[PDB]
C-alpha cells in the first residue's frame, strides 16, 4: 500500500503529530482527509509530510484544506517537511 498516516498524542492531550508517509495524489486524498480527527480538541496540530511525496495540485489543495479545517477548530497548525514532499511536483510545475 502507498499511503499511510499515523499520529501521536501529547501527554496532556494538547498536541497531536500526524505522520504522513508515502504517496499523496488524487487517488489517496479521500483516505488522507479521513485520517484526521478534525474536531478533536487540541491546542496544536503538526502534519508531518517529510516522508511523503505530493504528486498533484489536488493533494496540495487537500493539505491546505486540512490545515484550514484544524485552524477553524481552534488549533495552531504546523506543517513539517512541506519542502521535501512538494519538491517533486514543484520542480516539475
Amino acid at each position: 500500500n502507498a499511503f499511510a498516516v499515523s499520529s501521536e498524542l501529547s501527554a496532556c492531550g494538547r498536541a497531536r503529530t500526524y505522520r504522513v508517509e508515502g504517496q499523496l495524489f488524487y487517488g489517496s486524498v479521500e483516505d488522507f482527509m479521513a485520517a484526521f480527527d478534525f474536531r478533536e480538541p487540541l491546542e496544536r496540530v503538526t502534519i508531518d509530510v517529510s516522508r511523503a511525496h505530493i504528486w498533484d495540485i489536488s493533494s496540495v489543495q487537500a493539505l491546505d484544506m486540512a490545515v484550514l479545517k484544524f485552524r477553524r477548530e481552534g488549533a495552531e497548525v504546523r506543517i513539517v517537511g512541506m519542502n521535501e514532499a512538494s519538491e517533486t511536483l514543484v520542480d516539475r510545475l
Copy 2:
C-alpha cells in the same frame, strides 16, 4: 522493460520503464546488505509510470538508509515527470 546497473560511494543507474509489473524484479536489482557510507539511486534514465513504481523506489531508498548508508536520488524529477504529467 527496465534495467539496473551500478558503479563502486555507489551509484545505481535505473533505466527504462517502471510499472506495477516490475517491482519485485526491481527490488532484486539492489544489494542492501553491502555495508556502505553513501548510495545514490539515479533514475534519470527511467520513466516512473505509476504510483506503485514510485512507492517501490521509496522502499528501496528506505532499506539503504535502514542498514544504513546515506541515500540520495538524482533524476527523480525527470523520472517522475511521466507520473506528474500523467496525474495532472
